[PDB]
Assembly symmetry: C3
């Protein structure tokens, strides 16, 4: 019997089925493709997150990706759907091994001491996380885009988050916030025309945090 707990989530048709949701810095809701794989070893979680945007984004009148960059937040509630109430980024249910060991991947209470990132409970609410938010663990990477779209050095910030003011009045388990900045060097305005074939990926970004201990 495996000593590991595992967590895997991606759209049923894979990362190119962009049916997740991210909150932009402009408070727009963007479609996202995601692939997340995490392994728990004696309560320590190591993970990889991949996020893919298509060139179909909504920005403000006169806003240009070439000046603003692509800045957005993905939030994972590992207890979903054992806890059904919170799913900001509209994930499908994860594959968890063993079955229903989702709580193993909830960030431990010590992942948010002194202060904590607090988020509202609904996809429509304002849960954009600034890239310089207190508590973020910061990672650097070069994204990859199709054709003539060129992106500079990207940043991901991640941390535990508490979800506040749920409709039921029940305290949800903690979530993990992933906030991304992709500065754009050249190409087109990602906020203007729908170009569904034109895609940028973060590639698989590593992260690590403390959850709860799985023991077989």
């Amino acid at each position: 019997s495996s000593p590991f707990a595992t967590y895997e989530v991606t759209p049923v048709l894979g990362i190119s089925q962009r049916n997740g949701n991210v909150k932009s810095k402009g408070l727009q809701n963007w479609s996202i493709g995601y692939y997340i794989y995490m392994v728990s070893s004696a309560g320590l979680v190591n993970g990889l997150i991949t996020l893919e945007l298509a060139h179909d984004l909504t920005g403000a009148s006169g806003e240009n990706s070439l000046t603003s960059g692509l800045n957005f937040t993905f939030v994972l509630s590992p207890m979903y759907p054992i806890e059904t109430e919170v799913n900001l980024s509209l994930i499908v249910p994860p594959t968890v091994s063993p079955t229903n060991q989702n709580h193993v991947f909830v960030p431990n209470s010590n992942q948010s001491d002194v202060g904590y990132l607090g988020l509202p409970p609904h996809t429509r609410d304002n849960w954009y996380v600034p890239i310089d938010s207190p508590g973020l663990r910061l990672v650097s990477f070069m994204p990859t885009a199709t054709g003539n779209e060129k992106f500079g050095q990207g940043t991901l910030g991640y941390c535990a988050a508490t979800i506040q003011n749920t409709s039921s009045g029940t305290t949800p388990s903690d979530a993990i916030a992933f906030t991304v900045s992709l500065p754009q060097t050249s190409g087109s305005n990602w906020f203007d025309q729908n170009a569904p074939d034109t895609v940028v990926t973060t590639g698989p970004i590593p992260f690590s945090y403390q959850g709860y201990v799985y023991s077989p």
Copy 2:
């Protein structure tokens, strides 16, 4: 029987009991709260370190945290207390699983080849590690502070260290040095008044190194 070795250390009353010691860039001894959790998988150690300072620091006459930042070093001797002689940061004994497998977490001899960070053996000695010291692995994060205290992007550097010139003349097992820079954007001078309720945390910072192989 678990395939993992684990190492956990924190003050008995938790990270808010700031009875550890860090060496500042000014060679002052500051009280610190710490929480360290490490897991060994076939000789590869993955860890999380959290460090918390209160607003009770000693600096030079006329020194201001708003100009100088908070720069300090924490040193972990994983063999403590099987080896009793070295404990620069004044930790309590760790919880190690299995019991007395502390040596699993000593950095491997190949973690310090060509040159090595060398440290003196006593808390009172000069074991401050500059943030640009040769051999550091560097990580970025946003710390979190109480109230109106605001900190910019922080840096942690970590590496294996040899301890030199022990009182017994016995060569101690290697230690791990963790050196931190917290630049401060706004708030108060952390070197002036005792404000014990005013706290900054690094949050849980990930790190990885090679130790010795545990096999059940």
Copy 3:
């Protein structure tokens, strides 16, 4: 029976036997010492890579390391030597546990979606990877050098790579590219005189990626 798969590779006489090959930014072939250790946990690979150069490098006429830095690429084909055709960096066969589980450490097809880093198949070919190449995961560290040689903050980029246009016409398994930038602060021109005693090491740099699942 261990739940882990492990991968270890280094020259037979250790990292100071610099019989590996890296491709420089000038498209020169430099001798390198390497030590790589990786552990696979339910298909997630955590690794440490150490690279050592001696002061015996070939550069262009009039090129100076003090102005250019040391910029070079190491490529690991984890299937070697089960797949014999590809070995850009001239490694010796790795120690893999269990024996012949090399494919566990091949980066998963999802490590190179949207675009992919493509490399040629022969050591003599042009497989230098720019430090700002799309798809790199980026890490920071302070290297260590002997004597009066002083290096600033280094960068490593890593990612999955496909090998293209093999002599056999067989598609090799994917490789991992490791590209390094070591800016030099002071000391001598590493491109001029042979000083075999004069060495710079990256130290052990952590990295993480998704391979294939090993189950005992």
